[PDB]
Amino acid sequence: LIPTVIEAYDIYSRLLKDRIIMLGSAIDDNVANSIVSQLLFLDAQDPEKDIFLYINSPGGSISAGMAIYDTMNFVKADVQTIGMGMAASMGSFLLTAGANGKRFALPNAEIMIHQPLGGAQGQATEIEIAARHILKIKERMNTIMAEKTGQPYEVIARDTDRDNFMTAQEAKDYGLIDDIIINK
Template identity: 35%
Template structure:
């Protein structure tokens, strides 16, 4: 999608993504994958290079996705010198909810958005010998422990409380998200429009 931009040299067409990036707005949308993680990281690098004081708004509408790709995004959010504000603009499920809750400079949900937490899932059918299956199981349990530690750190809940909450697909309204410590504030669209 392209938008028209007026400047001193006339009217030009730019992509909506470019226009939003110039306003320091970055999206995590759709399935989280290695490709989407790399695109996100590139944008955060550019915005940090431009200005480390001005906030970056990350707008999330994602069903989740690959844990390793999500952890790459998480590391960048935590290390960004520019403050990153998180906005849930629809749904933030699974890894999307972990990323949303990890915001250190404001975690905002629109009134009809939703979070969902659960245990890490295997992406593919499990096959192989018993040693391979045992190794996969141990790795999955370690990933679950790491995810629970991250959620505990960002929600103020104990790891035991997080483990209980993630033992099944647990859906959170904005109000429930705030009560559990996943969200700071429920806001309307105008908050996203602020610069």
């Protein structure tokens, strides 16, 4: 059940009117396109007002995530990220990708930086290309993360290739989020 608010909206539609986007499922291609569209709609509505992207996702397709990421940068509006419950892999990468000074996590949010295989080599059958591609895309993901966190590249490259859990406080200290929001 998803309730229907009359001003007739569904609950998410009503939140969208207040510029809130809920990313609360695994990031596949249908999810990406729904996020992208919402970011396109909001920026056309009012490109001055901030946008609030709440993230609760175990991750998903790397190209689908990169599409959300690129649209976050494309839009004129500052995109604020709030991690809740769990932000793992592409979810945690999207959290870190929020506008500077505006990346948040609720006190008890699980955060995993590890980005696993995920099938980044699309439909490639040849070994030479498929292996080498996923290293390139691995490499330019580690670079965007080094920049956003201020961690040396090599630390990032090491940390995203191992299972590692973080509390909201450790994530703040790491540079993945700017602050922990408890209230307001």
